[PDB]
Design a protein around this ligand. Structure first.
Ligand SMILES: O=C([C@@H]1CCCC[C@H]1c1ccccc1)N1CCC(O)(Cn2cnc3ccccc3c2=O)CC1
Length: 330
């Protein structure tokens, strides 16, 4: 494959999986390399740690470690990974980066890549009164219980909810009305991070293992309030984050097609291997997926830009090799 894996150094669960995904987000990798981090602390800085891991993954011929990372962002209790979830670990990661790339030539790259626009609204039935509001999203959680494929989920996500009596809406000025409450998409970011909800709550959490399908190609113009010609919302599956187990244990993996070309690889901790399209997609409908990444067709070449070794500044490169030199002593 040419690509190197991450070391299994404890119960990082999904962290490794996620990291590989961010690594193969090339415009994110480049931008991360451009962060001003010569003044930062070797073990306490998050942004420096993510540089180290990315550099290491690009150059090392030996599985890469991640202890300085987990130390940087301070998840170190016996279950701080078991009890958090991926959107969380992501946010911790991308907000430290968002904010470091600020008054920099690469400022705004995170929003550029991940931010989308929602409009959420309530609307009174009998009496006339409307409440519309814009929200920014960096990821989307989709339900699965009673859903066969992603299309159903999207149709369910934008579905209107009813606010019938006993649960009517406080129009305040206009009293208690029955109301239709819904959400609509204005825009979808270059990179779609969709999470599946396979962990529920307290009927009596439980990992749902119910069959749930998803395509290599995902068309989303129906869900946009306004399509445009000349940039449709057509999306190319890039990565499939997988887990096999229950609410007590399991094993986490990610299937990736890094160059978006449809040549897939499985990343099992320290063991990358080629694999079929079938093993990455269809074989994880339910050993099932819990998060998917899509990139917009029109954006692929700009998101998966080639990354030379010259793209790392030398001040960085010097620094890291130094840290390797010291940390080579018995
Ligand atoms: O590793 C685990 C847990 C760790 C403890 C044991 C179960 C394990 C798990 C859970 C669901 C699927 C696969 C593995 N993960 C990673 C993936 C996810 O984070 C996906 N997600 C993400 N967001 C949600 C938001 C609302 C409702 C449900 C979910 C949900 O299931 C859940 C937790």
């Amino acid at each position: 494959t040419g690509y190197v894996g991450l070391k299994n150094q404890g119960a990082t669960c999904y962290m490794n999986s996620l990291l590989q995904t961010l690594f193969f987000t090339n415009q994110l990798r480049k931008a991360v390399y451009m962060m001003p981090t010569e003044g930062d602390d070797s073990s306490k800085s998050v942004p420096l740690a993510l540089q180290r891991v990315f550099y290491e993954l690009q150059h090392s011929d030996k599985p890469v470690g991640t202890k300085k990372l987990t130390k940087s962002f301070g998840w170190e209790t016996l279950d701080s990974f078991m009890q958090h979830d991926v959107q969380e670990l992501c946010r911790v990661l991308l907000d430290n980066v968002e904010n470091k790339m600020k008054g920099t030539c690469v400022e705004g790259t995170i929003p550029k890549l991940f931010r989308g626009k929602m409009v959420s609204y309530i609307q009174c039935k009998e009496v006339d009164y409307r409440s519309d509001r814009r929200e920014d999203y960096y990821d989307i959680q989709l339900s699965i219980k009673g859903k066969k494929n992603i299309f159903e989920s999207f149709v369910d996500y934008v579905a209107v909810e009813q606010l019938d009596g006993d649960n009517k809406y406080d129009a305040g000025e206009h009293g208690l009305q029955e109301a239709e409450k819904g959400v609509k998409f204005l825009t979808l970011p270059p990179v779609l991070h969709l999470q599946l909800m396979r962990f529920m709550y307290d009927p009596q959490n439980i990992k749902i293992n119910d069959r749930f399908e998803f395509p290599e190609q995902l068309p989303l113009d129906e869900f946009l309030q306004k399509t445009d010609p000349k940039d449709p919302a057509n999306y190319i599956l890039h990565a499939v984050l997988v887990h096999s187990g229950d609410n007590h244990g399991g094993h986490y993996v990610v299937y990736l097609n890094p160059k978006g070309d449809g040549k897939w690889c499985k990343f099992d901790d320290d063991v990358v291997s080629r694999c079929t399209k079938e093993e990455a997609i269809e074989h994880n409908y339910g050993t099932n997926a819990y998060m998917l990444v899509y990139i917009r067709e029109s954006k692929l070449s700009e998101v998966l830009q080639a990354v030379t070794d010259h793209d790392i500044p030398q001040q960085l490169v010097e620094r890291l090799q130094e840290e390797k030199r010291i940390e080579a002593q018995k």
